[PDB]
Amino acid sequence: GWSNFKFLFLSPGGELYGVLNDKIYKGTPPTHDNDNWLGRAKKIGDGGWNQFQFLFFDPNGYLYAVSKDKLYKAPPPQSDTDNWIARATEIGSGG
Amino acid sequence: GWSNFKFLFLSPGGELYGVLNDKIYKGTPPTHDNWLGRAKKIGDGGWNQFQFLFFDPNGYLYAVSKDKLYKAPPPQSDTDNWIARATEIG
Amino acid sequence: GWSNFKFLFLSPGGELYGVLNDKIYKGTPPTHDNWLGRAKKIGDGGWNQFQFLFFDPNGYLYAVSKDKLYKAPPPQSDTDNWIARATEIGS
Amino acid sequence: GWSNFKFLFLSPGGELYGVLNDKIYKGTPPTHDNWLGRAKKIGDGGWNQFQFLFFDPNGYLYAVSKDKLYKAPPPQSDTDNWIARATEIG
Amino acid sequence: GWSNFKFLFLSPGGELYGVLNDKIYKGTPPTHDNDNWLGRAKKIGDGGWNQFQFLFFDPNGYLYAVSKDKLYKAPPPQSDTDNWIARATEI
Ligand SMILES: CC(=O)N[C@H]1C(=O)O[C@H](CO)[C@@H](O)[C@@H]1O
Ligand SMILES: CC(=O)N[C@H]1C(=O)O[C@H](CO)[C@@H](O)[C@@H]1O
Ligand SMILES: CC(=O)N[C@H]1C(=O)O[C@H](CO)[C@@H](O)[C@@H]1O
Ligand SMILES: CC(=O)N[C@H]1C(=O)O[C@H](CO)[C@@H](O)[C@@H]1O
Structure with a gap:
């Protein structure tokens, strides 16, 4: 469902960030194909x-x-x- | 010009990468230069x-x-x- | 309007790059009193x-x-x- | 206010800058208003x-x-x- | 000379403006050390x-x-x- 993300980008602490359906998630990147x-x-x-x-x-x-x-x-x-x-x-x- | 790109992003080796009209390109970022x-x-x-x-x-x-x-x-x-x-x- | 840019990203060197219409700009990222x-x-x-x-x-x-x-x-x-x-x- | 400002000038971008009792304010030039x-x-x-x-x-x-x-x-x-x-x- | 002016500023077009003694004046900026x-x-x-x-x-x-x-x-x-x-x- 990766094509449904609005953002998919990386912190310098190695976590992957992702914005999906108005929510935002984080976690270390998947390593294998079967990782959920x-x-x-x-x-x-x-x-x-x-x-x-x-x-x-x-x-x-x-x-x-x-x-x-x-x-x-x-x-x-x-x-x-x-x-x-x-x-x-x-x-x-200039707020 | 630069807006015809779909992606345009930097590698950590310092190289800019740009997707344009289905092809991808790389080269060092411009500073002044085509x-x-x-x-x-x-x-x-x-x-x-x-x-x-x-x-x-x-x-x-x-x-x-x-x-x-x-x-x-x-x-x-x-x-x-x-x-x-x-x-x-x- | 920071949204007018099609691309907005940083360099390993700490510089801010923005593409706006057909041009590209390279400058110091903006900052947070004193x-x-x-x-x-x-x-x-x-x-x-x-x-x-x-x-x-x-x-x-x-x-x-x-x-x-x-x-x-x-x-x-x-x-x-x-x-x-x-x-x-x-x- | 006008005579109470220390400074009253415009940026190259057309915004008016005003310094008044140690504070600085900016905003669109008047055309008239407060x-x-x-x-x-x-x-x-x-x-x-x-x-x-x-x-x-x-x-x-x-x-x-x-x-x-x-x-x-x-x-x-x-x-x-x-x-x-x-x-x-x- | 110059220190007697109250206002002395440049138009966006490049002309120098000065207020001297209730009067105001304009003209292209002094071009050299000799220019009055x-x-x-x-x-x-x-x-x-x-x-x-x-x-x-x-x-x-x-x-x-x-x-x-x-x-x-x-x-x-x-x-x-x-x-x-x-x-x-x-x-
Ligand atoms: C864009 C943003 O900051 N969204 C947050 C918000 O507005 O507050 C909520 C708590 O009420 C958080 O769950 C959301 O992450
Ligand atoms: C998305 C991708 O991998 N594209 C490549 C591809 O399709 O194979 C070609 C070589 O055969 C390459 O020139 C392309 O850059
Ligand atoms: C009016 C003027 O030009 N003052 C300069 C001066 O006297 O030399 C210094 C450099 O060494 C500078 O710090 C000062 O800005
Ligand atoms: C402040 C101001 O506008 N002064 C003008 C004025 O009042 O009328 C005079 C001619 O009528 C001008 O010579 C003055 O420059």
């Missing part, structure tokens, strides 16, 4: 991830994200209940 | 089929096509049938 | 001499001190001595 | 310390403070000011 | 320019003036007989 990645991935965000147009890491752990006019930089979401967009530092336009 | 003109074509078709394309820091290339995920060292040259030999990890 | 500085100190000493200090549309800097007008490109670092290479115009 | 009440406050504290505060054509903000000279992106840059400080390698 | 800028400068206002605390251009050549809590916008004056203050928009 979704089934061992941690869900670290439950709604609102599809709004984004770019979403990537720098090598220092920071997660960049573009939502329409705006660029955010912050450490990645840590759980389900971590409202990332609410605490992410806007560095984007 | 990139596409001095760029090595390293694939000759099949490259639009991908939804994602990305390097890990070890120099492995990741690719998603038709609900399948692939991993291997990047296409070496236009004679290299990458998708035929890349490892399905889906 | 302007102010830091950053960035472009000259040290001699600067409150001046009554006016302003730019050419071409990026040449003008300054007025003691009834004389001075012109030169701006210093790129605080080691660069400006007035010293600034030529005076107005007789 | 410019202050509806501006974005982009800095707080020490803004009155400068003797000069002005742009270069390329969107760098210059500042004179305590006999020294300073240069940086304005506080709270936007995308257009980024593109202008950027090297176009298109 | 005021001598050839075109007088573009003959009264009422000491009143301003700020006097500046935007990118499109509009001129702004601040005077007792009123801001004034309009294309710049062009001569002795151009009543700028009265045709300016009174923000």
